[PDB]
Assembly symmetry: none
């Protein structure tokens, strides 16, 4: 509905998507600390790790991009009205 209503939903969906991001990174850290202390990490392990990081960001990027398009519309719309009344 109203402008500020939709926006708020985007912001909350953003805050919830950032939450899941920090968690996956927290998960990936735990797993790294496990293998390390227990044995030691291999170049193969460091690679997987690295790989999962880019992957995780790409997943966050999708959300970011979506929120970006929606607010992009929201602002284009604004300027339309703004032109018409000024």
């Amino acid at each position: 509905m109203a402008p500020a209503d939709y926006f708020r939903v985007l912001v909350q969906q953003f805050e919830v998507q950032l939450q899941q991001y920090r968690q996956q990174i927290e998960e990936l850290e735990n797993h790294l600390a496990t293998q390390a202390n227990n044995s030691h990490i291999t170049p193969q392990d460091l690679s997987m790790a690295m790989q999962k990081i880019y992957q995780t960001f790409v997943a966050l990027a999708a959300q970011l991009q979506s929120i970006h398009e929606n607010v992009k519309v929201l602002k284009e719309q604004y300027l339309s009205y703004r032109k018409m009344f000024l």
Copy 2:
């Protein structure tokens, strides 16, 4: 020293970098939950946040990229010694 002590040092920095990354992202989650508490998050607020996420990621990337190069060298040095003896 041995290519196993140097690797552990790399892996060592990877973990520190990742921890430092997760913290900036934690701080970022709060700052947002702060603004929403006080008043509300505006489109400008969202954008700067959106922008700090990429800012904050690029930085992690310099870090990863570096560790990647160093382990690329170690991996190539290997295939050489491997070619030498077959």
Copy 3:
């Protein structure tokens, strides 16, 4: 002023006090990871560390206790009125 107004201030002051807590713990972790990787931690170090933890909680406990007394009043007050009108 109003009941819900004062309360909200307590809650926000709580959320801000919890924030500083997690940060000190984050700081104490960083320092531990430094000494460890660099050299190794001594029994003396582990002791200081332990000590600062209890200290940090005690500092959080003070805030907790304060918020507890205020909301304790808030609820006692409520029951007064509740009795009087029921």
Copy 4:
């Protein structure tokens, strides 16, 4: 094995425990910023949170207390060998 490999293993668990502690507290900060976002944090909400903090701390304490005992033994074993040779 040596009392220096066992100590490092203790210190190892200390760090893991502390990390795990900081996470529960991070999750706790979000959950609160979640409820406030949706509607608002009530007195009941605050209390359960207040209670999880002590719950969550007691648990960290079992962990610390343990590491304390083990390093107490190592410290006493020392003074014995020390008394023996003076």
